[PDB]
Every structure is written in structure tokens, then in C-alpha cells.
Design a protein around this nucleic acid. Structure first.
Ligand SMILES: *O[C@H]1[C@@H](O)[C@H](n2cnc3c(=O)[nH]c(N)nc32)O[C@@H]1COP(=O)(O)OP(=O)(O)OP(=O)(O)O
Length: 125
RNA sequence: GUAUGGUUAACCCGCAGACGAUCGAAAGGGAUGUGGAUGAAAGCCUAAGCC
């Protein structure tokens, strides 16, 4: 298990995280790739950040969970980084994706934002 | 004199790429860049370069 994964995410909740990227890709604006994601977080324009769990080395995305907590931006973990790139609409894999405007997925992001709040309180005791 | 340029183009497999393609000195920026296989007839036009 990676060290940058602060909390475990169930499969069913992670599957909706890909759907949010899929919907917001067509009905909103997302940013695919770790560089675009990092900029979207430090600029404070990212509604939800999605981080992959199969990132090696960790030093590529290990700074997002700390940065997202400072900027008070929710984040959720996805197992596959290739499926993450597929949901963003690119041929290659993606280590992280940032959702700027959810669009039609506005409701789905709210549901994920609540559960990542509850999952974060449980792992923190 | 000469096509490696045209009239005249497709269709296959591969390689690199959101761990950042193209562009840029960098900053920036964000999805293409490319190697090969068979085709690209005949005739005709042009002659940069080369001889
Ligand atoms: O048939 C051509 C050719 O034999 C000869 N010619 C002119 N330049 C070259 C060259 O660089 N390399 C070769 N191998 N042959 C060349 O000239 C013939 C054409 O006749 P012209 O001389 O009338 O026309 P051109 O424009 O070639 O030369 P010119 O008109 O200045 O004299």
C-alpha cells in the first residue's frame, strides 16, 4: 500500500469518481495530467481532484493530498491510472485529474465530497 | 541533363507521449509527434538543389 494514500476508498465509491470525470469531460471542464492538476489546485479552481493508487515513484503525486488539504479541496483515490486516463479521454494513462467545472456531474461531485469527508474522519479516528 | 517537387492518394502495422506530444531561448502551455510496409500508373509540367 502506498504511503500517500491517507485513507482507503471502497470500490463502488471509486467507480463513481471515474463517472464524474467522464460526465464533466463532456459537460464541463476538467484538467488531465499531474501538471495541469497541480496548477488547478494552487490556483484554487479545482472542484475535485482524483489521484491514482498505482503511481510509482510516489514523488510524482505525493504532494497532492497535502496540497489539497491546505487549499481545502477534496480528493479521492482511484486504483487504476490507465482507467483514469481513459475517463479523461486520452490514449495514455493519467496519474491525476482535476475537475474544474463538473457540469452535469454537479450532483455526483457533491455525493463524492460528502463521502470523502466521512471516510477521512474515520481513518483519523 | 536531373524529382528528391508536382498533376495525384490512399491503406496497413509499429515507436515516443498527461511520469507532458506540438511550439518556445525560457516562462508558458496541453495532444499529438514519427518510422516502416505495399501503393503513389502512363503521359505531361516545373528545375530549387544536384550533376
Ligand atoms: O538539354 C539541356 C542540357 O543538356 C543542357 N544543360 C544546361 N544546364 C545543365 C546542367 O546544369 N546539367 C546538365 N547535365 N545539363 C545542362 O542544356 C540543355 C537545354 O538547352 P538550353 O541551353 O537552350 O537551355 P538551358 O536553360 O539548360 O541553358 P541556357 O538556355 O542558359 O543556355
Amino acid at each position: 500500500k502506498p504511503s500517500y494514500v491517507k485513507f482507503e476508498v471502497p470500490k463502488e465509491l471509486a467507480e463513481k469518481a471515474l463517472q464524474a470525470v467522464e460526465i464533466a469531460r463532456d459537460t464541463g471542464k476538467i484538467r488531465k495530467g499531474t501538471n495541469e492538476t497541480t496548477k488547478a489546485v494552487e490556483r484554487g479552481q479545482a472542484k475535485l481532484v482524483i489521484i491514482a493508487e498505482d503511481v510509482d515513484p510516489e514523488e510524482i503525486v505525493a504532494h497532492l493530498p497535502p496540497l489539497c488539504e491546505e487549499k481545502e479541496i477534496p480528493y479521492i483515490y482511484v486504483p487504476s491510472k490507465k482507467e483514469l486516463g481513459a475517463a479523461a479521454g486520452i490514449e495514455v494513462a493519467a496519474a491525476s485529474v482535476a475537475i474544474i467545472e463538473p457540469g452535469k456531474a454537479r450532483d455526483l461531485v457533491e455525493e463524492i465530497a460528502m463521502k470523502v469527508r466521512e471516510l477521512m474522519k474515520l481513518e483519523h479516528h
